[model samples]
Target chain A: MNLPTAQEVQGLMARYIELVDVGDIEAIVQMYADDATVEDPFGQPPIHGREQIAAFYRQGLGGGKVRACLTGPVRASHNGCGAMPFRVEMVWNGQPCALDVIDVMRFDEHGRIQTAQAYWSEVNLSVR
Target chain B: MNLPTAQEVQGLMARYIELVDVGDIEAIVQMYADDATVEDPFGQPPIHGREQIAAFYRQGLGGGKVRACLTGPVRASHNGCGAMPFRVEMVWNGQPCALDVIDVMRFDEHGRIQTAQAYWSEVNLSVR
Candidate 1:
């Protein structure tokens, strides 16, 4: 695979979000390389390798209906990188809540997602 | 001062976008460290240091009313990093247009922005 075009990066980002929204765990996991790492909430240690990455998501989305929604257009870099802002509406501590999040992905030369960093924290998580 | 908390990082990102919307060039510049670098559109060489970075912003917001608006909540990391999505409603080639953008900022130890990389490219430039 050649270096991903901006459209290609943008397309994958949109699809990735949709996969999460619909609880397609395996589909979402498949977007990564065999060794792709996930640093969710950042600052914490990364979840390394595809199988480990899969477990991480299954733990989060396993209950289903996570309902992630893209809040804006995906921003793509000239390099094979992109970031997107979204909100996840779900149950937290037995209360209805939503978290505003941003996900940054870097694609390898083969266009597989080589790295994924999720930016979110307790601060932006709102309970209602 | 004291590795910025999630709220601190979130606050600056919100303020940064507001500054851009109001064309507050000097205020925007003040948010960066003297040696901060900017990589707008990414993949390009960075605009290094405060002086050069000032020139870069002046060229873009100098005309005024660039009208950058946040499209979603700013995402904050446990690390001193954040990403935001916004839209720039402006004129391009003498025609009305808008560009969807995502800006990722890393804060130095003192809370000043150390690195600012914008994600956007021709793929998402809209002419209307």
Candidate 2:
């Protein structure tokens, strides 16, 4: 397995945001390795394996009710990690709002995401 | 308010990790701006303002039961942000264990942390 270039990692993150915005759950999950894990919003049990990860995203994005947009530039480290600031637009209690989020992802040697974590808080949500 | 350089942001994260390891809550909270916010492990209500941030860390580290270490290289973005993978060692249920974490921080113009978020899961804890 070859290490991915910094550009590749940045591209990976950008593509993730694009797919997520379109609710392309299938393509989004394919960006992970077979054993990838996702701990969305932290503090909860992580979704392990591609199957579970796919299911988690399916439930969240299936209805196309939520859309995400990258709020800032994607940052990539030399070691194949990327971080980006994003915002999720969704309806909460029948009111449209947005939540500020920061996500960090570690890529494997093959450029697949080995681990993905999303950071956000309910207090950070605001009506748009 | 001058924007912090990428190197400065990375150094801030390193210092934060070091302070957390030593249970130095005072110094850790001082790294934040007057209006800083922290959302550790995400999803929960964020601690807002320096005073609240200080009190939160004081209670958390007051017990001296937790110690943390960086597990991977720190990554910084040109826009005064950084991310790193870390692990926290602590006693749970009378057993020693560690939790894997990913933290992302956005720095203010004065190099203080404006917003800090940590992402992790209970399921990621491993007994050592």
Candidate 3:
């Protein structure tokens, strides 16, 4: 399988963060392959398949309070993989909170995400 | 303070991986500032100060069989921060094992790492 260039993967990561910040759930889901899986926080059960993934993000975006900032650049490998480090700021229960997150993604030949695993924890969250 | 460019941070990350692979504990320790802190795998207790940090790596490197491969490029921000995603392969009790890791680092004005947090888990480790 042909691998994506570093620039291409970085662009994909940038767009992913942009869409997430705007609560564009459908557009964000379109970036994944049909068999894509997402495991947020690594230890939890994953959201499998594009449909389930879309459903999961849809519920998240429905809250309309999440906005993300890319904390670092998107790092891409010669192989079809990349990692994005970011922070998500949101209002939860009338309190401003932020979460530090790092997501590692493996891409398909089509430049679509096959698997995305997010690393984060309550310890990485802060309330102001 | 001047922030390091992406290329500079990537180079630092590459050197870090090379040093770790070769068990160059002293060189690796020198990459951090005097007051640097490291938290490997996020949830664990952190190793603080350059002296303690060096001691920790000295013990880890004494085993002499650890090798690492960069899974993705080093992603850096305009700010003095970056992230590296990698996999480390090592032998434990004569068994080949690998661990997936993502490390986020904040750099000081002089380009030394001020804080480094590694995201990983035993769940991310596999015996080959």
Candidate 4:
């Protein structure tokens, strides 16, 4: 069992943004282990397990047409599992918006995502 | 003005929870310098300057009818500015709910809060 390198996490983050932006729900689910948890800052309930989380993506990715283009200057820290800080620029309704999101992920011994926590502002919804 | 020590910041946070839970809007406003910025994760928009920030608190404190009891194990880091992590238990509508919040605050050289960013999950709103 080996921990993921910082570079690996950064690459995964980029791929995640791509998969999510394109509404590739299946790809997004595949990235998580069988038991993973996803939460949004809003009143939405916490989505647990890969299947449910995947379903959540189906609803969001299917409905809210969003294209997220990530911004640079990402920095990673090992700290137990790992963490990455980056910004995402979203294009929606003919406008470009940007919000910062910080991802803190913990991996199983097998390098699978055990848990992931995303931190972003409420204004992130406006990012283009 | 001297940069606040970690202890001082922690104390301030405790006081902040107390003030907000009690709807002591004036006390909360006095804690910040004249110019300050506060942001919430939800779509409420960023509140800038002490006056606006104070007003924002008034709306939430007046309408929410909430009391927040914070828990232990707070860790602070000085990253250019400073950041703290803690779990807050809120009593709302006869329900006891708990959510974790991370606060990253930057102070001007004059010992006044220049900016504050609050990170918390939507589930936090459910806390009693």
Candidate 5:
């Protein structure tokens, strides 16, 4: 696999934020490979495979009033892995809250995203 | 100015977190240059210069038991700047809280840290 240049990786990061902000499900799906896995902090099961991951994005958009900011720089590897930390501000079911998340993405030899593992924590929630 | 290698920067990050966890103000201050600045989310004035930043660390240590976990990897430029994101879990006055922080650090040509800018958000904080 030909590793992306630093500038190209940076551009990909920007595009990711833009796509998430607009809830562009189709565009988001295109970024992933046929088999990908996503895990968020809620301790829920990982959303596995490309189709499942795409569906997960759609479900996420169903939540109301979400705006996310990439709080830290994204780190990418010449060998095909990347990670980023972010903050999301949103009102869910009329309750305002903030969520902090760290996502680790791994790509295959073909340069397609094969897995995404996320760690997250929420404040102002009564639920664990 | 000699920029530290990835290994050296990694060591520095580990030391920073260890110092903070143990409330080691003197050790933490030694990492900074005479003129360093730190900013947090509360809109408080930036803790300017080494003395003030050290004092602020002391004040923060006095707050309560604090445990911080760096949720994501730290990135350092071969040219003397670096950034990282972390999640801090703490007990302040018997309240369990979490803070997500993004810190940007710049180093002088001599490899001494000259500035530190931090952006943070708290979950479940009525004080914000």
Candidate 6:
């Protein structure tokens, strides 16, 4: 399988964060391959395939306006992978909160993300 | 096995950036478990165990006064994992350059890092 270039991986990662924040379900789903899998919180059961992945994002986007913006430049790997740091601003249970997140994405030969894992937890979430 | 808390994983990641910038190889090495493995650039052969990982960092730290600093807060996971964005300042071939890196670490039961993967590539390196 042909590997993606570093530029290609980085560019896709940059575009991903934008699409996530834009909350366009179809646009976001198109970034993934047909067999893509996503583990939003890591350690949890992965949402398999493009259809399931779309449903996962759809539910998340329906909750609130996810204000996710990259906090730093996307870091690429020699392999077909990239990682990015971003924050999601939300209001949960009538309380404003922010979650600092880093998403790691591994792409297919065509640079479409095949696996996505998001890193974040309780401490990363700040509430007021 | 008691899995590491998100706070513990985040704390270790925070400490790691300090040790990397301080150039304390032994101190840095001690933070990892004896059987730890590191895939520094990804796609490359992993440096197995503490000894090999130490040697890898030794050569890297010996290159010059390596400056590595976290660019943002560490992102944690429900599992014993964390990811952080950092910049490594270096001078290669008389050209001052910096690498934007994102490192993902998975810890063992005791919270010592057992697996570390650094994400960065040619495009992530900016030279001036």
**Candidate 6 error regions (>4 Å):** B93-95
> How does residue B79 of candidate 1 score in lDDT?
83
Judging by DockQ against the true structure, name the best candidate: 6
Better of 3 and 4 by DockQ: 3
Model 3 regions more than 4 Å off: B1-128
Clashing pairs in 1: B1-B110
Q: Which candidate tops lDDT? A: 1
Error of 5 at A11 (Å): 19
Distance from true location, Cα of A3 in model 3, Å: 3.2
RMSD of each: 1.5, 15.5, 14.0, 17.4, 14.8, 2.1
Off by over 4 Å in 5: A1-128, B42-44, B123-128
For model 6, how does the per-residue alpha-carbon lDDT over A90-111 read when each residue is reduced to its tens digit? Answer: 8788788899989999998877
Cα lDDT tens digits for candidate 2, A1-128? 45666577668988999998899998998999999999776434678998999999987888787889876556555567766677788887789988766678889999899999775544446886
Across residues A35-77, which tens digit of lDDT does each residue of candidate 3 receive? 8989775656788888899889977777987999777556555
What DockQ do you compute for every candidate structure? 0.80, 0.04, 0.05, 0.03, 0.05, 0.84
lDDT of 5 at B101: 61
* iRMSD for every model: 1.2, 13.0, 11.9, 14.0, 13.9, 1.1
Please identify model 4 stretches exceeding 4 Å from their true place. Answer: A1-128, B42-44, B63-65, B78-80, B86-99, B125-128
**Candidate 6: pairs in clash:** none
Of candidate 2 chain A, the 10-residue stretch with the lowest lDDT total is A117-126
TM-score of each: 0.94, 0.53, 0.54, 0.44, 0.50, 0.92
**Model 6: DockQ score:** 0.84
Higher TM-score: candidate 2 or 3?
Answer: 3
Candidate 1 CAPRI assessment class: medium
lDDT, candidate 3, at A124: 55
Q: Candidate 5 chain A: minimum summed lDDT over ten consecutive residues — where?
A: A119-128
A1-128: candidate 4 lDDT, tens digit per residue: 35655455556656777886777888888888788777553223567898788877776677556556544322333322443344445554668765555555666655667777665444334443
Q: Between candidates 1 and 4, name the one with more favorable lDDT.
A: 1
